[PDB]
């Protein structure tokens, strides 16, 4: 799909047996989703920085699907005002910016 | 140009007679640049929100150039950790996401 930017690029994403709404964010290094009970082991990770850090759960090699396209990558699980699809997942989708 | 996302999408941008480094950020509504002495009148604007707002200077119909392509739009001038090219300018460049 080609996605124009007149509106916020919000997509439906299938992850962990759920469907969530998330923002495609080329300015974000990582993908962060609000709480979902992903299975298996995780690593602690600290995100943020300005004013302090938030501790989140890093899950590796997680499958997500966006607009019929699948992608495997790290998903951070923790509090976030909006669910963020960041560059680590955008590259797995083949996502590019074009102008 | 086609821009892959293995690295942060940082570009050189010509604005206000200067050249600055800025991030192409599809998750950002607005374009925010650190201090540049743009000419003429401006409107107060408050950005941010989480933990409070920052007052910035809104300049309208400002020309910027990125990778040989020109674009006219609103530029907010104020403190920002990184210079942000947001959707309001990305649409003016013809920028689209593609996967
Ligand atoms: Na972004």
């Amino acid at each position: 799909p080609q996605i124009t930017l007149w509106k916020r690029p919000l997509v439906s994403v299938k992850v962990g047996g759920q469907i969530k709404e998330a923002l495609l964010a080329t300015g974000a290094d990582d993908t962060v989703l609000e709480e979902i009970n992903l299975p298996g082991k995780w690593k602690p990770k600290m995100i943020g920085g300005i004013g302090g850090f938030i501790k989140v759960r890093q899950y590796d090699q997680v499958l997500i699907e966006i607009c019929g396209k699948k992608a495997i990558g790290t998903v951070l699980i923790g509090p976030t005002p909006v669910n963020i699809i960041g560059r680590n997942m955008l590259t797995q989708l083949g996502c590019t910016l074009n102008f």
Side-chain angles (χ1 to χ4, degrees), chain A residues 30-98:
Chain A
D30 310 310
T31 295
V32 193
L33 311 176
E34 80 211 310
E35 291 277 1
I36 297 161
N37 179 15
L38 293 175
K41 76 184 208 155
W42 51 272
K43 307 181 194 280
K45 192 173 170 44
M46 293 188 201
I47 64 177
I50 307 282
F53 296 86
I54 298 209
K55 301 168 156 65
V56 294
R57 303 196 318 273
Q58 171 176 334
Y59 291 88
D60 291 324
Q61 298 170 30
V62 173
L63 178 79
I64 69 154
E65 179 180 322
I66 296 175
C67 299
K69 191 160 199 329
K70 292 177 188 185
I72 299 277
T74 300
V75 169
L76 306 182
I77 296 298
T80 172
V82 67
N83 296 322
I84 301 298
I85 307 303
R87 284 189 299 103
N88 77 298
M89 283 295 197
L90 296 174
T91 62
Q92 298 300 311
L93 275 309
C95 200
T96 57
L97 283 164
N98 302 88

Side-chain angles (χ1 to χ4, degrees), chain A residues 23-29 84-86 90:
Chain A
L23 179 71
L24 307 183
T26 56
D29 300 335
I84 301 298
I85 307 303
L90 296 174

